[PDB]
């Protein structure tokens, strides 16, 4: 085999035991760790035998539930100072004959234990700095310690990586091109012409461009959500506005857009006009589906499923047959706990904008339905399978966050939607009550007969359709 240092000078040499590390039954084929002590977890995070860069992500994403950032740094620095072995018998004999020792064993342990383990400690350091930098912003003593650690690493072996990490740390202290093969489609205009932001509305913007700008907007919002806003279920806790501002900004955009769809519908009192309005919205839903904007799809589906909109039977009697079919397909994505949606998501060709809600529910229940620790033989092991499960979720998310949309921003339409505020100065209950009342006004309950209302739109109600055009 190969000899390790003493467990009395190097804590990470303790033999594996069911009192310090438990493996998942199934198997690449590297072992999957079910539970372990922090010591054992950090040993495996930087094991000498095999690579597992996925383990590096899982660990750096979820470690704070069981070990503080300063403690982590201390233990990897400890892991990094591996003591060298004493010369062997062969070696001793040559030194007392005035020869140079072969140092075979020492040279092997350096190449097969020390070098891999130190390289993987530096790897944890690189990733921790590149992708989890917030630990350092919130604790500058921690950043000093890291900077010092990197800056005291001598040895030409580690020379290239030490310089690199130093540079990366410096970039992050003081602070993203995109390249497409193809060129984006032409921005499409309807009644509202470019620059005329005063006239922008649901019916006057081109429905194709409404879906696209909302999709750029919603994609950006999705891509900004960091795993720190997710781990610990912190978005549901008292300080959610502090810890999860991007996630909340995005959920909030979704709710505004849904409530805006509702408002547009129930505030169009004339039946024929309201039918045009509902119709256009389903058109926007269609372009959302084309763009794989699943958040956008659900925005529309939620609007249609809402209390004041669902009951408008006279309005939906008059929707074209093709559009009933579209709203039905879309609604069905959510049936059986989002079964068809999940199937569709895991089957499309990105870019896409997932629906973030599924993720929040799974992370939360995962954190809540598995124990922090496993007790074996009186000992307490960190329950790591729980942590790997949360990381698979944050991983899914991060994965859909990479691919950008090949679409042109139109700044004015972008501003228009960023500033959308359907509720005005009203609180959510009183605005929600208003919407439902307006719904009662425009189509009363049976058996009250259906009133008539005057038209409100001066411009044409004909949709220009959802098929892109193309001059040049």
């Amino acid at each position: 085999q190969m000899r390790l240092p003493s467990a009395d000078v190097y804590r990470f040499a303790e033999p594996d035991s069911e009192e310090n590390i438990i493996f998942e039954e199934n198997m690449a084929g590297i072992p999957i760790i079910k539970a372990g002590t922090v010591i054992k977890l950090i040993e495996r995070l930087t094991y000498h035998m095999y690579a597992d860069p996925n383990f590096v992500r899982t660990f750096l994403t979820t470690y704070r539930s069981f070990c503080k950032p300063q403690e982590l740094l201390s233990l990897i620095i400890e892991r990094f100072e591996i003591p060298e072995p004493e010369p062997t018998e062969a070696d001793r004999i040559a030194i007392e004959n005035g020869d140079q020792p072969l140092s075979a064993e020492l040279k092997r342990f350096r190449k097969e234990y020390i070098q891999p383990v130190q390289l993987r400690v530096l790897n944890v350091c690189r990733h921790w700095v590149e992708h989890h930098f917030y630990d350092f912003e919130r604790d500058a003593y921690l950043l000093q310690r890291m900077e010092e650690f990197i800056g005291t690493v001598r040895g030409k072996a580690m020379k290239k990586w030490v310089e690199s990490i130093t540079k990366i740390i410096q970039r992050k202290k003081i602070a993203h091109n995109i390249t497409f093969q193809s060129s984006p489609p032409t921005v499409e205009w309807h009644i509202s012409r470019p620059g005329h932001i005063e006239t922008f509305d649901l019916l006057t913007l081109h429905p194709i461009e409404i879906a696209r700008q909302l999709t750029l907007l919603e994609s950006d919002l999705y891509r900004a959500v960091q795993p720190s806003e997710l781990v610990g279920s912190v978005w549901t806790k008292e300080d959610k506005e502090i810890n999860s501002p991007n996630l909340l900004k995005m959920i909030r955009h979704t709710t505004n857009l849904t409530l805006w769809f509702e408002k547009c519908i129930v505030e169009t009192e004339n039946l024929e006009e309201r039918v045009a309005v509902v119709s256009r919205i389903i058109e926007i839903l269609q372009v959302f589906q084309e763009l794989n904007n699943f958040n956008g799809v659900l925005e529309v589906v939620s609007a249609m499923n809402s209390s004041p909109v669902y009951r408008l039977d006279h309005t939906f009697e008059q929707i074209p047959s093709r559009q009933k079919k579209i709203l039905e397909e879309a609604h069905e994505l959510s049936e059986d706990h989002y079964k068809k949606y999940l199937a569709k998501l895991r089957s499309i060709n990105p870019p896409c904008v997932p629906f973030f809600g599924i993720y929040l529910t799974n992370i939360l229940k995962t954190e809540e339905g598995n124990p922090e620790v496993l007790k074996r033989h009186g000992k307490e092991l960190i329950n790591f399978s729980k942590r790997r499960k949360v990381a698979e979720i944050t991983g899914e998310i991060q994965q859909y966050q990479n691919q950008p949309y090949c679409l042109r921003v139109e700044s004015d339409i972008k501003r228009f939607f960023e500033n959308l505020n359907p509720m005005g100065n009203s609180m959510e209950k009183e605005f929600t009550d208003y919407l439902f009342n307006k719904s009662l006004e425009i189509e009363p309950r049976n058996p009250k007969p259906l009133p008539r209302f005057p038209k409100k739109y001066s411009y044409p109600l004909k949709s220009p359709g959802v098929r892109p055009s193309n001059p040049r």
């Binding site: 279920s233 978005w235 549901t236 806790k237 008292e238 959610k240 909340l248 959920i251 909030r252 979704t254 709710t255 849904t258 409530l259 509702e262 659900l298 589906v301 939620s302 609007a303 499923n305 809402s306 209390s307 669902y310 009951r311 959510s334 049936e335 706990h337 079964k339 809600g357 929040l360 529910t361 799974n362 992370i363 939360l364 229940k365 995962t366 809540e368 339905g369 598995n370 124990p371 496993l374 399978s385 729980k386 499960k389 698979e392 979720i393 959510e428 209950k429 439902f436």
Partner: protein
Amino acid sequence: GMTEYKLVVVGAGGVGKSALTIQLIQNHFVDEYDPTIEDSYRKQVVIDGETCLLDILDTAGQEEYSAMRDQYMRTGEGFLCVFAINNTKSFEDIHQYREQIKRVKDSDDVPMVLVGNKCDLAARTVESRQAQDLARSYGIPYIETSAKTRQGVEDAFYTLVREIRQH
């Protein structure tokens, strides 16, 4: 062949809610729970010697998606309205959830159960008497659970199914 019931859990977030449904579905005499897994919200049970299937929709964690609430509620026959006994706001929220359910189902009586949940060892701030009285005025059962210790979890779901049966 047997009856399938659609149960929907609603209530303020950030308290104990999720613990309820988890405690029912699982039976942590085997560790590792995974909500990722299909039909980890499906559970076959015998209530009053009549076997049935319980389909539990608990969207815990999506509370901030407040406009998706009508959509989720619409899917269900019976409702667990949950608050936390050590969080008065969540108790005061109960009225609005109920009013909202009445609205999407379009009925003055929808099979529902009020559930007061003990999620931690903090001082209780909603006494069981206030909760009972509120439940009485709504004309619905009141079940108090500590989902942490499995106490009262079955009582809450089974009572709710009884309500659906006696509508």
